[PDB]
Amino acid sequence: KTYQCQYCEFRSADSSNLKTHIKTKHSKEK
Ligand SMILES: [Zn+2]
C-alpha cells in the first residue's frame, strides 16, 4: 500500500516525503 496525509488529500508512497510534507504544508511555524 501507500501512505495518506491526515490534513489534505496527499497520498504518497514515501514516508520521508510525507512527514516533511505535513511539516512544510500544515504544521510549519505559527
Ligand atoms: Zn497534506
Side-chain angles (χ1 to χ4, degrees), residues 6-23:
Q6 317 306 299
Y7 300 100
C8 70
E9 54 180 1
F10 179 87
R11 53 185 59 113
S12 292
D14 197 292
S15 182
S16 303
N17 306 308
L18 173 54
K19 305 298 160 68
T20 298
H21 164 77
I22 294 166
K23 185 189 69 60

